[PDB]
Structure formats: C-alpha cells, structure tokens
C-alpha cells in the first residue's frame, strides 16, 4: 500500500546518517585481517 497515503513517514536525515555510518563501520572491519589482543595487568601473585 502507498505509504504516503498513510501516516507513515521517516525524516530523510534518518535514512541518510544511518545508511552512511552503517557503511564506515562495515568498511573499518573489512580492512581487518589480524587482531592482536594482549593480556591486561595480572595481580602480583608473587611467589616471593
């Protein structure tokens, strides 16, 4: 059914800012091929 004939309507801005950022996120991860993940700082747990 024709949407304009209906109350339904979303601001153009929303359909843009969301379409655009959805891409950058995607891209940024595409460029990824290796994730070096170094451990944090452990408790001293010193035997001495």
């Amino acid at each position: 059914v024709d949407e304009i004939h209906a109350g339904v309507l979303e601001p153009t801005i929303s359909k843009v800012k969301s379409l655009k950022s959805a891409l950058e996120a995607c891209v940024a991860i595409l460029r990824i091929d290796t994730m070096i993940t170094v451990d944090p700082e452990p408790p001293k747990e010193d035997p001495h």
């Binding site: 800012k17 950022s21 950058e24 996120a25 940024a28």
Partner: protein, 70 residues
C-alpha cells in the same frame, strides 16, 4: 600556538591587560549541530598568519585515531 594563531600576545598579571594584546578577529563560533551534539569552539578570522588547524571526524573513535594517523 594559541598566540601566533590569534595574533594576540600573552597577558601576565592584571595591570598590563592592555588593548595591545587584543587578538583582532571577526567572529567566534560555538556549534553543537551534527552528530554528536558535542560542540567545538571555532575562531575566524585572524589577521595574522602562520597557523593552520583541522578538525577530524569519524565514528567509533577508531576512525579518528586513524584518520589522524593517516
């Protein structure tokens, strides 16, 4: 940096605050539009020369610390 930019000399102590060290400019900007609502102070324009600045933008903060790197 702030000095050589806005052409305004630094003012130390209270007695001196003279009309000499005034930074001859035409407009100060404090905008908050565009995601995110967070704002940044923009200053233009100053008669002096030799200082240039650029504001980076990107989501996740990953793209900032990388567009900056790039």
């Amino acid at each position: 940096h702030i000095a050589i930019s806005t052409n305004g000399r630094i003012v130390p102590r209270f007695q001196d605050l003279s009309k000499d060290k005034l930074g001859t400019c035409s407009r100060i900007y404090e905008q908050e539009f565009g995601t995110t609502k967070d704002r940044m102070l923009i200053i233009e324009q100053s008669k002096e020369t030799k200082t240039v600045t650029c504001f980076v933008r990107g989501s996740n903060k990953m793209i900032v610390d990388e567009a900056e790197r790039a």
